[PDB]
């Protein structure tokens, strides 16, 4: 038997053994997240440890088959993903040091508390304490206190840990024959051996920077409009030509500008579309919300939810004694078991989240026939993009009127269109420079282009230049403000939120064209279009079996990430922003700072 034939038999044994052990771990994990007990924590750990030990053993056995002697690519993809060393390429001591560093940074982030001055007992955590301040407070000093105290008392603890974290992660990546840990993260987009669909790791940097140049004009006019509105609210705190102070952006970091809507709403006398009252008027419950979401996917040709979905999912808060983790999640336990965990309320937000989460389920059900190691999104940004486009169609007035939640007499004028697009841009467009700049800083740190004694100097030079955001207090190199965000201190790649954002509007534009939608893209509803559902399903069933460039081509006809659909979505707002900024300064100077005086 050849080496490839032995690998096929090895993967055959792995699949049946992995599915069983993955199901037992997922089932134990489900029982804890729906029934937070002490016994369920141990059963979740016992089942989880057996699954992690199985993967570690199978990874070593997989490295006994040389990839070069395998020619069938679908076999090479499964072997490659299983042969991935990760932290197991380091010595046992250095991997133990790294895991201790990772746990300490995660513990500092989740337990980090800030105490109000003159009262060492009135202390606040990030969630919900500091997050509530950064999302609702209009007081300049209260927001400044929360922004600075979080970074000066929790961020400074993470600075020495993050320095050693970079050293060990780079040693791990370079031992896996990567340039550095950032190049290791960019491997998620790598494709080799498929003529016409290949993609290098360094190509991601060029494509992200190239598409971001086309985003700058829209962002600069969004930035200039927000600055002018905030300048009317804080006249003595904001310069007409300077960056936006970092603590006045809607959350702890300015990751999204969503909470700036109250102060920046273009037409503040026209109310939003909130069908929450109509859902309560019609006595809707959680099952009705997911039944309507099920009807949505059925209307485009996708299958209904399984019988086990309705029986095994937790669509309502268990209430009273039995506690649960109420964060909405879509579960793919394998072996035909699909569930959704969600403490659903009768609101419009949960109505849209249900369509978002059930989009993950439709994705999981579509590639369930793939081999175990290929059951995932085409890349890290595919799964979340599929979920986002479901809430896009479900939130439109055209869709809400077809299901009886929005009044037919309710008419939509261009002022409510601008209000909606501005609300969308604060979340979607506002996060793109944040995401790109944060990941570029980490890429350069891992690449060695930023010395340790200039980490925070370069972090805020890039905030001012790229993001147009200035720190309200000067920070020396004892700070580690990037680590004050969850994803940085918890070792998660961040560029996935940039690529996913561009993917979702490429998906939506393609599906709406298949649905023969006429008019602006943001008003599209793909409901009742089996042609759009068929075009989406051709990519969903692929899973990870094909290059993501080919999976993207099945939906949109293009092989690469493209920013034009994003700009098409926001064009009515872009033209309105350019007219609003005609007597305002567009762009920002980088030398002004709120503490310069």
């Amino acid at each position: 038997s050849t080496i490839e034939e032995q690998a096929k038999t090895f993967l055959d044994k792995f699949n049946h053994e992995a599915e069983d052990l993955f199901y037992q771990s997922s089932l134990a994990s489900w029982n804890y997240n729906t029934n937070i007990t002490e016994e369920n924590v141990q059963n979740m750990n016992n089942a989880g440890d057996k699954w992690s030990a199985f993967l570690k053993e199978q990874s070593t056995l997989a490295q006994m088959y040389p990839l070069q002697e395998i020619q069938n690519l679908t076999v090479k993809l499964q072997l490659q993903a299983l042969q991935q060393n990760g932290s197991s390429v380091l010595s046992e001591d250095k991997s133990k040091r790294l895991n201790t560093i990772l746990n300490t940074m995660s513990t500092i982030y989740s337990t980090g508390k800030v105490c109000n001055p003159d009262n060492p007992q009135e202390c606040l955590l990030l969630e919900p304490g500091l997050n509530e301040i950064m999302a609702n407070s209009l007081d300049y000093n209260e927001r400044l206190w929360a922004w600075e105290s979080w970074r000066s008392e929790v961020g400074k603890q993470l600075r020495p840990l993050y320095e050693e974290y970079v050293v060990l992660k780079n040693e791990m990546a370079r031992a896996n024959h990567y340039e550095d840990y950032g190049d290791y993260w960019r491997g998620d987009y790598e494709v080799n051996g498929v003529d016409g669909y290949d993609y290098s790791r360094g190509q991601l940097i060029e494509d992200v920077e190239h598409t971001f140049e086309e985003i700058k004009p829209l962002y600069e006019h969004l930035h200039a409009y927000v600055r002018a509105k905030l300048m009317n609210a804080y006249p003595s705190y904001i310069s007409p030509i300077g960056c936006l102070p970092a603590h006045l952006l809607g959350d702890m970091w300015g990751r999204f500008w969503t909470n700036l809507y109250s102060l920046t709403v273009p037409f503040g006398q026209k109310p939003n579309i909130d069908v929450t009252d109509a859902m309560v008027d019609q006595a809707w419950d959680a099952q009705r919300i997911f039944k309507e979401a099920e009807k949505f996917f059925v209307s485009v040709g996708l299958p209904n939810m399984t019988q086990g979905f309705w029986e095994n999912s937790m669509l309502t808060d268990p209430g009273n004694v039995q506690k649960a983790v109420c964060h909405p999640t879509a579960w793919d336990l394998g072996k035909g078991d699909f569930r959704i965990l969600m403490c659903t309320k009768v609101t419009m937000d949960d109505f849209l989240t249900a369509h978002h989460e059930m989009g993950h389920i439709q994705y999981d059900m579509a590639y369930a026939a793939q081999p175990f190691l290929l059951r995932n999104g085409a890349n890290e940004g595919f799964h979340e993009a599929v979920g986002e486009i479901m809430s896009l169609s479900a939130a439109t007035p055209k869709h809400l009127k077809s299901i009886g939640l929005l009044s037919p007499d309710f008419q939509e004028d261009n002022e409510t269109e601008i209000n909606f697009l501005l609300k969308q841009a604060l979340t979607i467009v506002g996060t793109l420079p944040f995401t790109y700049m944060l990941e570029k800083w980490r890429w350069m740190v891992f690449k060695g282009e930023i010395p340790k004694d200039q980490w925070m100097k370069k972090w805020w030079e890039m905030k001012r230049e790229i993001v147009g955001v200035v720190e309200p207090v000067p920070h020396d190199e004892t700070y580690c403000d990037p680590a004050s965000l969850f994803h940085v201190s918890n070792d998660y790649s961040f560029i996935r939120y940039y690529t996913r954002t561009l993917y979702q509007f490429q998906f939506q534009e393609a599906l709406c064209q298949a649905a023969k939608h006429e008019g602006p893209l943001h008003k599209c509803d793909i409901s009742n279009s089996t042609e759009a559902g068929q075009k989406l399903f051709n990519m969903l069933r692929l899973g990870k079996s094909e290059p993501w460039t080919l999976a993207l081509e099945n939906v949109v006809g293009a092989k690469n990430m493209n920013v034009r659909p994003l700009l098409n979505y926001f064009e009515p707002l872009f033209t309105w922003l350019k007219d609003q900024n005609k007597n305002s300064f567009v762009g920002w100077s980088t030398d002004w700072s709120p503490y310069a005086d």
Partner: protein, 194 residues
């Protein structure tokens, strides 16, 4: 004499498909119509015979093969089928003359935490002949190095378990199958009756 079909369909435990059980039925009256009008009924496909006009002709011997597989594998209990079950566990001939009966047994053969009583053969040197049974436990040699009787690199135990849990999808839930073979040799009729 009524044919002992109750011992086959209503057995407490079914056999594993790799060690499928066969019960020879002889010298009795079989109301093939009284077995078709039951509650728990799902798959009932006959080949070469007619289920409407079942208990009308006579056979020399009737064989009842019973085992358990998952839902998505009931399709393999048919002539000219491929897959782990049809190739390595239970194979029907191309000219099969009989009926295949299957029903969902998730209430009996599943258990919270996993029921590992039922096994199936995952690897074998060659495919099975029709109505052949292989209960060997020889370590399958996938490579060239001998296995010495223990599992190791390129040396796998040939039998795999289902681990039936009641929360599986229908395609993974246990199904009890009964295969009725109808033989007609050069001997006077022994099994027929309305």
């Amino acid at each position: 004499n009524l044919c002992p079909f109750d011992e086959v369909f209503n057995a407490t435990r079914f056999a594993s498909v790799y060690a499928w059980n066969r019960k020879r039925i002889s010298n009795c009256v079989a109301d093939y119509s009284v077995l078709y009008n039951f509650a728990p009924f799902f798959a009932f496909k006959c080949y070469g015979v007619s289920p409407t006009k079942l208990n009308d002709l006579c056979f020399t011997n009737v064989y009842a093969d019973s085992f358990v597989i998952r839902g998505n594998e009931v399709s393999q209990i048919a002539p000219g089928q491929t897959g782990n079950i049809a190739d390595y566990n239970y194979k029907l001939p191309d000219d099969f003359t009989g009926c295949v009966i299957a029903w969902n047994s998730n209430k009996l053969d599943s258990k919270v935490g996993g029921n590992y009583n039922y096994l199936y053969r995952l690897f074998r040197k060659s495919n099975l002949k029709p109505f052949e049974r292989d209960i060997s436990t020889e370590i399958y040699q996938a490579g060239n190095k001998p296995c010495n009787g223990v599992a190791g690199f390129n040396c796998y135990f040939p039998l795999r378990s289902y681990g039936f849990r009641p929360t599986y999808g229908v395609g993974h839930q246990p199904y009890r199958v009964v295969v009725l073979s109808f033989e007609l040799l050069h001997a006077p009729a022994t099994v027929c009756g309305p």
